[PDB]
Amino acid sequence: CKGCLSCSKDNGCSRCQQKLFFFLRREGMRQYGECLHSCPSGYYGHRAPDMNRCARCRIENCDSCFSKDFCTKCKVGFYLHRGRCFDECPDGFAPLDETMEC
Amino acid sequence: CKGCLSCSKDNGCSRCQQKLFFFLRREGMRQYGECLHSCPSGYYGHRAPDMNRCARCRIENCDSCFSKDFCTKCKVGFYLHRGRCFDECPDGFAPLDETMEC
Amino acid sequence: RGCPTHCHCEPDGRMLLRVDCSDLGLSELPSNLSVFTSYLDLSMNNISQLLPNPLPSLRFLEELRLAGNALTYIPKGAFTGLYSLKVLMLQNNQLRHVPTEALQNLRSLQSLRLDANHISYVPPSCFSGLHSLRHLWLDDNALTEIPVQAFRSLSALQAMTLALNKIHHIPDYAFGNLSSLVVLHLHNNRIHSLGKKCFDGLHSLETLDLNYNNLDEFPTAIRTLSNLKELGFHSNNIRSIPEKAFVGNPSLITIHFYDNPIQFVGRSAFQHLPELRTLTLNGASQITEFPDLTGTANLESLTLTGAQISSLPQTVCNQLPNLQVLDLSYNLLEDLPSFSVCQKLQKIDLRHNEIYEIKVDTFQQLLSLRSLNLAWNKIAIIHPNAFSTLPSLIKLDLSSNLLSSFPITGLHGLTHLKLTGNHALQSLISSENFPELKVIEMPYAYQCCAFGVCVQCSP
Amino acid sequence: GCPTHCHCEPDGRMLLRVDCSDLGLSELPSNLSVFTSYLDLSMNNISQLLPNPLPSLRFLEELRLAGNALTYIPKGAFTGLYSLKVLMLQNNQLRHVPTEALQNLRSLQSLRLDANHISYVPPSCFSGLHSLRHLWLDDNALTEIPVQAFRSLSALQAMTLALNKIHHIPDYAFGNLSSLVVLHLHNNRIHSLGKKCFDGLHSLETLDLNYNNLDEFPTAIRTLSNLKELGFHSNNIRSIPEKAFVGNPSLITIHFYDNPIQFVGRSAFQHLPELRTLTLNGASQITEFPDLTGTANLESLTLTGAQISSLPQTVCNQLPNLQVLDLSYNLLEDLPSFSVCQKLQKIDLRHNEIYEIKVDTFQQLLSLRSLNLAWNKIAIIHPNAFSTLPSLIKLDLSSNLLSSFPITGLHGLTHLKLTGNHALQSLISSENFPELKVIEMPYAYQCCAFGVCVQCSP
Ligand SMILES: *[C@@H]1O[C@H](CO)[C@@H](O)[C@H](O)[C@H]1NC(C)=O
Ligand SMILES: [Cl-]
Ligand SMILES: [Cl-]
Ligand SMILES: [Cl-]
Ligand SMILES: [Cl-]
Ligand SMILES: [Cl-]
Ligand SMILES: [Cl-]
């Protein structure tokens, strides 16, 4: 219940401090709310006046995000190009093996 | 089933001939439709362009009725006046025993 | 063997005889009827003539049923000798006019059923001498006009139906001498026009039914009906209810006028009706003002939708102390008064208006309120204590508003909550500020999951 | 194997992840391994860093300083961090972007400056940041676009300036951000845009102007030829003009709910062959259904609260892929045939003025699950109108003017709603509707007859 304005027993945090991101950690049988400075791997932080939350990366073959349609680091074996992840790095630009990109 | 355009099984009549009244008999578990020329005692017949139906009288202390709010014969021990059933026959006109009317 | 062959018989309360000879395909009457017969049922047979009858000997016969036979014609003397006859049933036969003479002078007759024949003509004096007639059924025939002359006689009549015929006009004084008439049913005719005095003479009338007709104009003729308690003119083509419309009808409990293209309603139209229990207007476009209900304090239900109502008076609940249902969906409401003086309210529907805020006192101390619907407004703020004193509140719909947060206090008893279409409402809400919730519609699915659902939650 | 109280784990077979977050540290720890690829110093009490062991961390790729007490970052703070790809300074007390500490971090790809109190971007604070791809400046005190500083970031692909106080965007504000793919400007106070305020953004696929104060349709998007997603919901725009999206043929998504939209040009939504959804609620001055020529891939169309009184006979020819149609709350009287709309799964025509349903209207809609015709003026339905709707599951004909109701093709229903049809006094029987689980009859006696005095009301 760190970074939390409004805590509880079994649910963890329910409302975060102004500038932090809400994230639902899921152990299985029960789930707890958390207030984070940045979102964990697989998620991106979305700010709004009322609250900020970690939302899931919406992108094929992506491991990390800037936003829901912009990838920042692709799944293994896929090449990063303009925020997207492709098997073959499409014509017009070659792939950088050493770099894992285009 | 009698007087009926649509005889179901596991059931009574579902739609009656044009000028007959539908009435829902309750045998106990199963209920059955019937098609009557006038409605059984405690009910009035209601006619509409494609469905005539026996509706129950819900006038208090009444046994038969013409209409929803017009009684035609009260229960035992009650007096009929303008289609309403009274205990005391209200001032302006007294009871009159031979008929149980006012 | 005290009963005719194939018939079934039973003593009545006075040990006079009830004889059932219905549904035996008889073409002629049975032979050996007891002079002590009080009831004779000859329904559903093939009787087209009553020439050979033993009826003259049935001096105690009170009720005769001839429904569902093939009568086209009833001769002068058919009911001679039935000096006790109270009820005659001739429904569902093939008469094309009311017999000219057979029904005259049946002095003890109280109830006459002529319904479901093909009757197009009521001869001028066919009810002559019916001094005792109380109930008359002429429904489902082919009448094209009120038989004004034939009804001149019947001053003892209490209940009549002319429903399901082809009557197009009711002239002045059409029922002019029916001073005992309590119920008159004219539904399913083709009545377009009513004389301005067409109901004069109906001093005792309590129920008038003009439902399912073709009226273009409000029936001014009811002004005379000072004892009217139930009035029905639904499913017509009426376009306005004028001022002082019900000024002559202070006893009205029930006025039904739905499925009329009503557009305008007069300022005063619904004042001074202390017994009226329900009022319902759906689709009344040109109504810009909430009606004055002075002297009309007993409404349990009020529905006024599809109009141009912009405001309600601050003191509107002073006129609505017994109101249990209020429906003003589909108007232009912006500012709500306080509803607290409407102490009895159980249900409030204010969907599809233009409401922008809920204040602290709008819903205060409505202890019986169960369901409140504010869907499709423009609500951006709800005071945090707006719902503090609604212990009965069970359903709350705030769908499609402009909210950015959601109050807790006073809503622990909710079973139904609806919030979809509030995009800015991104705050969570936790499962035991709302332990009793069973249907939730959230703005986002992550609000469902955080609640503990990923009990019905959408999305 | 690790600074005291910190937590360390291998990152590969050589390098090291060091977690020193949330230890209430006032100063950096002392014995930091040269093997450190990742260092987390978040949630601590560090107000500046001058006594640092950072210069020896030549393999450090990620440094996290979120949620500390930083007001000031001195010029040499990050010298020697040749490998630094990610720098996180969000949730600190900076009031302007450090004037010099951030220049010439040549490896730096991601910089978080969000949730500070930044009111000023010095003109050359980003000089030398040629690797910078992602910049977060969301939730600060910015009052205009720092045009100057942004000329030095032409490799930038993603940026957010959301949750600031920006009120105007001048011509060429982003004019050398030719690589920018995503730009977020939501929750600002933008009230006016230059007619060329987005020129130079050749690569931009996403633009987010939601929750601002625009009075006027941002015609400056016309140069954004690669725009796939546009958002300008929750502004004060009343009109979408003719040829509005003519420069944006790849748009997949355009969101503009919660605007007081009233006009839409005829041509506005033509020639958008990738657009999947169109949604107009409350569009109350609209009198004609918009032309969708060359815009054939809509899966959902919602157009409500308008003055639409008829659809063109041939309207489904432009809606071959439509799955959801919502035209509730209009003035529709006569319906065309929707049979060319083969993919329809839901039709909502509630609160119109529809007077009959013909044989032809809904024929061969094999995927139609749900049809809502509540609150119309329907007095006849053709007996075969629903003959070929094998997927029909929900039918709502509440508050119409019916006096009869078809059986043919409705044995599959689970939901039937008939209340408010006063003339419908005829009986419906459970044999024709074995699948019903929710029923609203015109009268309670009709429920009883059904076998119910599985839910029937009243
Ligand atoms: C009314 O009917 C009664 C009874 O038949 C009769 O005495 C009288 O002449 C009639 N009066 C009028 C005004 O028609
Ligand atoms: Cl999500
Ligand atoms: Cl009933
Ligand atoms: Cl004759
Ligand atoms: Cl309810
Ligand atoms: Cl500085
Ligand atoms: Cl609705």
How is C38-63 classified by DSSP, letter by letter? EEEE--SS-----SS--GGG-TT--E
Do the Cβ atoms of D234 and C258 come within 8 Å?
no
**Quick one: tokens of C377?**
């407004």
Do the Cβ atoms of D258 and C423 come within 8 Å?
yes
Contact call for A and D: 3+ CB–CB distances under 8 Å: yes
Q: Is C153 in the pocket of ligand 1 (CB under 6 A)?
A: yes
Q: Is residue C459 part of a domain?
A: no
Ligand 1 atom nearest to CA at C154: 5
Q: Smallest Cα–Cα separation from D410: which of D433, D437, D438, D384?
A: D433
Q: Three-state SS for D92?
A: coil
CA of C108 to the centre of ligand 4 (A): 22
Q: Smallest Cα–Cα separation from C350: which of C388, C389, C384, C397?
A: C397
Task: Please list, residue by residue across B16-47, b when 16 or more beta carbons sit within 10 angstroms of its beta carbon and e when fewer do.
Answer: beebbbbbbeeeeeeeebbbbbbbeeebbbbb
Q: Three-state SS for B22?
A: strand
Q: Is residue D457 part of a domain?
A: no
Residue D379 neighbours by CB under 8 Å, 6+ apart: D355, D356, D400, D401, D402, D403
Q: Is residue D321 part of a domain?
A: yes
Phi-psi region of D355 (alpha: psi -120 to 50; beta: other; left: phi over 0): alpha
Q: Is residue C458 part of a domain?
A: no
**Quick one: tokens of C420?**
């979809």
Residue length, chain B? 102
Q: What is the DSSP string of A44-80?
A: EEE--SS--EEEE--STTEEEEEETTEEEEEPTT-EE
Q: Is C177 in the pocket of ligand 1 (CB under 6 A)?
A: yes
**Quick one: tokens of D419?**
């209340």
Q: Is C165 in the pocket of ligand 1 (CB under 6 A)?
A: no
Resolution of the structure, angstroms? 2.2
Residue nearest to atom 14 of ligand 1 (CA): C177
What is the nearest CA distance from B50 to chain D, expressed in angstroms?
A: 6
User: What is the set of domains in chain B, with CATH numbers?
Assistant: 1-102 (2.10.220.10)
Bridge pairing between strands D253-255 and D277-281: unpaired
Q: Is the CB of residue B77 less than 8 Å from the CB of residue B97?
A: no
DSSP collapsed to 3 states, B59-86: CCCEEEEEECCEEEEECCCCEEECCEEE
Residue A39, Cα to own-chain centre: how many angstroms? 5
Alpha-carbon span C82 to C61, nearest angstrom: 6
Beta-carbon count within 10 A of D413 CB = 21
Q: Identify from B6, B14, B15 which residue to disrupt to test chain D contact, counting D C-beta atoms within 10 A and taking the largest count.
A: B14
Q: Smallest Cα–Cα separation from D180: which of A79, A71, A82?
A: A82
Amino acid, res. C65: R
Backbone phi, psi, residue D240, to 5°: -115, 115
Q: Which letter does DSSP use for residue D448 in this model?
A: H
Q: Is residue C4 part of a domain?
A: yes
Q: Is residue D458 part of a domain?
A: no
Q: Is C155 in the pocket of ligand 1 (CB under 6 A)?
A: yes
Q: Is the CB of residue D232 less than 8 Å from the CB of residue D218?
A: yes
Query: Considering only CB atoms, which chain D residues are within 8 Å of C188?
Result: none
Closest Cβ opposite residue C139 in set B37, B47, B83? B47
CATH value at residue D128 = 3.80.10.10
CB hemisphere CA count around D360 (13 angstroms): 5
Backbone phi, psi, residue D315, to 5°: -70, -35
Alpha-carbon span D362 to D350, nearest angstrom: 16
Residue A7, Cα to own-chain centre: how many angstroms? 23
Residue D217 is part of which domain span? 1-452
C36 beta partners: none
Q: Is residue C343 part of a domain?
A: yes
Mutation test of ligand 1: which of C134, C152, C203 has the most ligand atoms closer than 8 Å to its C-beta? C152
C153 beta partners: none
Q: Three-state SS for C152?
A: helix
Residue nearest to atom 6 of ligand 1 (CA): C153
Alpha-carbon span A14 to C428, nearest angstrom: 7
- Please report which ligand is nearest the Cα atom of D74: 6
Do the Cβ atoms of B22 and D427 come within 8 Å?
yes
Q: Is B37 on the interface with C (CB under 8 A)?
A: yes
Ligand 1 atom nearest to CA at C201: 13
Residue D436, Cα to own-chain centre: how many angstroms? 37
Alpha-carbon span D374 to D357, nearest angstrom: 13
D302 beta partners: D279, D326
Alpha-carbon span D314 to D340, nearest angstrom: 9
Task: Give all strands of the β-sheet with C87-89 in edge-to-edge order.
Answer: C8-11, C17-20, C37-41, C63-65, C87-89, C111-113, C135-137, C159-161, C183-185, C207-209, C230-232, C254-256
Phi-psi region of D220 (alpha: psi -120 to 50; beta: other; left: phi over 0): alpha
Q: Which letter does DSSP use for residue A40 in this model?
A: P
Residue C37 neighbours by CB under 8 Å, 6+ apart: C16, C17, C18, C19, C58, C60, C61
C255 beta partners: C231
Q: Three-state SS for C263?
A: coil
Q: Is the CB of residue C207 less than 8 Å from the CB of residue B46?
A: no
Q: Is the CB of residue D405 less than 8 Å from the CB of residue D385?
A: no
- The residue assigned the tokens 């919502």 is D326
Phi-psi region of C272 (alpha: psi -120 to 50; beta: other; left: phi over 0): left
Residue C232, Cα to own-chain centre: how many angstroms? 6
Alpha-carbon span D25 to D46, nearest angstrom: 6
CA of D390 to the centre of ligand 7 (A): 26
What is the nearest CA distance from C12 to chain D, expressed in angstroms?
A: 33
Q: Smallest Cα–Cα separation from C47: which of C94, C81, C3?
A: C94
Q: Is C433 on the interface with A (CB under 8 A)?
A: no
Q: CA geometry: angle at C285 spanning D395 and C217, to 5°?
A: 100
Q: Is residue D336 part of a domain?
A: yes
Q: Is C427 on the interface with A (CB under 8 A)?
A: yes
Q: Is the CB of residue C218 less than 8 Å from the CB of residue C237?
A: no
Q: What is the DSSP string of D326-394?
A: E--SS---B----TT-TT--EEE--SS---EE-TTTTTT-TT--EEE-TTS---EE-TTTTTT-TT--E
CB hemisphere CA count around C113 (13 angstroms): 22
What is the nearest CA distance from C187 to chain B, expressed in angstroms?
A: 9
Total number of domains constituting chain C: 1
